C-alpha cells in the first residue's frame, strides 16, 4: 500500500510517500523520516487516504 506523509514542521514542511503493507510500518518509516528531518509534532492519520500529518 502507498502511504502519504504531510509534514507541517516549523521549518520542515512538505509531503512524501512510502510503500508499506500496514499503516505500523508506515507510521514507524514516516515517524524515521520525520527522526531524520528533525520534526517533532502532533501526528494525525487520515486512514481514508492513508495520509499522516505532522503538525509541529
UniProtKB/Swiss-Prot annotation:
Biological source species: Streptococcus sp. group G
Name of the protein: Immunoglobulin G-binding protein G
Full protein stretch here: 302 to 357 of 593
Subcellular location: Secreted, Cell wall
Sequence repeats: 2-56
Amino acid at each position: 500500500d502507498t502511504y502519504k506523509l504531510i509534514l507541517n514542521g516549523k521549518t520542515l514542511k512538505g509531503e512524501t510517500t512510502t510503500e508499506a503493507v500496514d499503516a505500523x510500518t508506515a507510521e514507524k518509516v514516516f515517524k524515521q523520516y520525520a527522526x531524520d528531518n528533525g520534526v517533532d509534532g502532533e501526528w494525525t492519520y487520515d486512514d481514508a487516504t492513508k495520509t499522516f500529518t505532522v503538525t509541529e
